[PDB]
Amino acid sequence: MKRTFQPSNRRRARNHGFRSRMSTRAGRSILAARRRKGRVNLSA
Template identity: 65%
Template sequence: MQPTYRPSKIKRARKFGFRKRNSTKSGRKILAARRRKGRASLSASK
């Protein structure tokens, strides 16, 4: 059996990165919510 979590920075950035979040309406809502909350980092890549 293979490990279920095989980290890859590229895959992570493409799936949960800033550009991906910013490209959809709901993604922009997520970013806005995280800004409101005052998060240190908004997404996986930024």
């Protein structure tokens, strides 16, 4: 059947990309928190 994950790289980058996170203070704090934890991937 049709499943929940239908991949689109354009939509993924628009939704979770670095610039989307930088666009708002919540996303900037998410990037700061992922830096604090030490993730090698800060965003999509």
